[PDB]
């Protein structure tokens, strides 16, 4: 319930922060990934689109942010609910998260991997 709170008040406020204070506050919430419930992690993962399409647009930091939004979200790909499967399917197969072009989504999911996936 607290997580779920919390997560809640992330999703309700990041928009009057900047992302000198967002990298601090981010870096302790992707801990929550593989959390035993389902609930936080789809939150965190809300706040995680949230994130990349105002952030996937230059300072430094905030392109250190985005990068390790976009990171979590690739470990994220792996969801032991297969709800959440077909939320990230759904937001990943969207045209501004790949391109429409087959050849352009080839392209763009080349820089998208990891070694854990």
């Known amino acids: ?4 709170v919390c997560l809640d008040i992330i999703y309700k406020m990041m928009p009057k922060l900047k992302p000198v204070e967002l990298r601090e506050l981010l870096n302790p919430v992707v801990e929550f990934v593989s959390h035993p419930s389902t609930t936080c992690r789809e ?6 689109m949230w994130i990349h399409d105002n952030y996937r647009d230059t300072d430094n930091d905030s392109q250190e942010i985005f990068k390790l939004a976009k990171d979590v979200l690739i470990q994220g790909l792996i969801d032991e609910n297969p709800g959440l499967q077909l939320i990230i399917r759904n937001f990943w197969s969207h045209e501004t998260r790949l391109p429409s072009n087959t050849l352009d989504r080839l392209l763009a999911l080349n820089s998208l991997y990891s070694p854990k996936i």
């Open 1 to 4: 319930e607290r997580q779920k």
């Open 43 to 48: 939150q965190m993962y809300n706040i995680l």
